Design an enzyme around this catalytic site. Structure first.
Site, PDB file in Angstrom:
ATOM      1  N   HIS A 147     -37.867  -4.000  39.837  1.00 43.20           N
ATOM      2  CA  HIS A 147     -39.008  -3.935  40.797  1.00 43.20           C
ATOM      3  C   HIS A 147     -39.030  -5.142  41.750  1.00 43.20           C
ATOM      4  O   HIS A 147     -39.813  -5.095  42.719  1.00 43.20           O
ATOM      5  CB  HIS A 147     -40.340  -3.763  40.074  1.00 43.20           C
ATOM      6  CG  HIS A 147     -40.761  -4.895  39.188  1.00 43.20           C
ATOM      7  ND1 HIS A 147     -40.874  -4.765  37.794  1.00 43.20           N
ATOM      8  CD2 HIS A 147     -41.246  -6.114  39.480  1.00 43.20           C
ATOM      9  CE1 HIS A 147     -41.338  -5.895  37.287  1.00 43.20           C
ATOM     10  NE2 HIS A 147     -41.547  -6.741  38.299  1.00 43.20           N
ATOM     11  N   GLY A 173     -47.210 -13.074  38.168  1.00 37.25           N
ATOM     12  CA  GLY A 173     -46.636 -14.440  38.118  1.00 37.25           C
ATOM     13  C   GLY A 173     -45.529 -14.555  37.078  1.00 37.25           C
ATOM     14  O   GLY A 173     -44.508 -15.230  37.354  1.00 37.25           O
ATOM     15  N   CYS A 216     -43.502 -12.132  35.881  1.00 36.85           N
ATOM     16  CA  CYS A 216     -42.330 -11.209  35.997  1.00 36.85           C
ATOM     17  C   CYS A 216     -41.035 -11.994  36.214  1.00 36.85           C
ATOM     18  O   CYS A 216     -40.971 -12.935  37.078  1.00 36.85           O
ATOM     19  CB  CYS A 216     -42.509 -10.103  37.033  1.00 36.85           C
ATOM     20  SG  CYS A 216     -43.793  -8.933  36.509  1.00 36.85           S
ATOM     21  N   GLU A 258     -35.052  -1.145  33.796  1.00 32.97           N
ATOM     22  CA  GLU A 258     -35.849  -2.144  34.559  1.00 32.97           C
ATOM     23  C   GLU A 258     -35.112  -3.469  34.715  1.00 32.97           C
ATOM     24  O   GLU A 258     -35.777  -4.428  35.112  1.00 32.97           O
ATOM     25  CB  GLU A 258     -37.231  -2.338  33.939  1.00 32.97           C
ATOM     26  CG  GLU A 258     -38.264  -2.970  34.863  1.00 32.97           C
ATOM     27  CD  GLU A 258     -38.493  -2.292  36.207  1.00 32.97           C
ATOM     28  OE1 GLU A 258     -38.266  -1.055  36.333  1.00 32.97           O
ATOM     29  OE2 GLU A 258     -38.862  -3.022  37.138  1.00 32.97           O
TER      30      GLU A 258
END
Ligand SMILES: Fc1cc(F)c2c(c1)C=CCO2
Ligand SMILES: Fc1cc(F)c2c(c1)C=CCO2
Length: 182
Positions: free
Chosen positions: A41, A146, A148, A72
């Site tokens: 992402h 914050g 990630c 992911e």
């Protein structure tokens, strides 16, 4: 604050960079040579900023499992003039649960951050922001925007990268040794 904070600090000091995309700043883990990982992402493009230096992306691959399910994790090869310390020997070979983990974050706005999260569950399936995702680890810490790209470790193992949370629990994508065979 234990052998675990000692290990977390060693990984942050030598094997992280600050990566900036059009989606913000992320803790990025360097694994070996010029190869690093970031949550998918982050939407890595042809150009990325690494510690505020314009850097060409030589390759970027969003990993999926053999059921064609999102994991992911994006693996990135950077056109950087310096190699990472090789930490592939700290990556687990198999899906597992863990005790006494630390989540560590280093960005411009969120520097020097270490969080003892305790027990880590092999959660497996998660609908992450509407996307079916596999190989998720869960811990009972109310993580926010914050964190990630944050690195999840135990003593002597780098086990995942933080990808989300629901206000009560936090979620990490597994790192496995087999992702980084060259
Ligand atoms: F000064 C410190 C800070 C810590 F967090 C520690 C120690 C010493 C030693 C072991 C674990 O916890
Ligand atoms: F250790 C750290 C580092 C940070 F940058 C933080 C925190 C803790 C907590 C809040 C804001 O940012």
């Amino acid at each position: 604050m234990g052998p675990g904070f000692d290990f977390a600090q060693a990984i942050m000091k030598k094997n992280t960079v600050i990566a900036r995309t059009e989606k913000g700043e992320f803790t990025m883990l360097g694994v070996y040579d010029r190869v690093a990982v970031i949550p998918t992402h982050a939407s890595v493009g042809e150009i990325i900023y690494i510690n505020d230096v314009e850097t060409r992306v030589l390759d970027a691959c969003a990993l999926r499992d053999l059921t064609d399910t999102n994991l992911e994790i994006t693996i990135v090869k950077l056109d950087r003039n310096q190699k990472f310390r090789d930490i592939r020997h700290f990556l687990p070979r198999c899906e597992d649960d863990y005790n006494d983990a630390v989540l560590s974050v280093h960005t411009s706005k969120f520097p020097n951050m270490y969080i003892p999260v305790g027990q880590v569950t092999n959660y497996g399936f998660l609908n992450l922001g509407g996307t079916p995702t596999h190989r998720i680890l869960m811990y009972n810490f109310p993580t926010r925007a914050g964190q990630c790209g944050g690195v999840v470790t135990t003593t002597g193992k780098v086990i995942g990268i933080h990808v989300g949370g629901n206000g009560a629990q936090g979620f990490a994508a597994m790192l496995l040794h087999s992702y980084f065979t060259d």
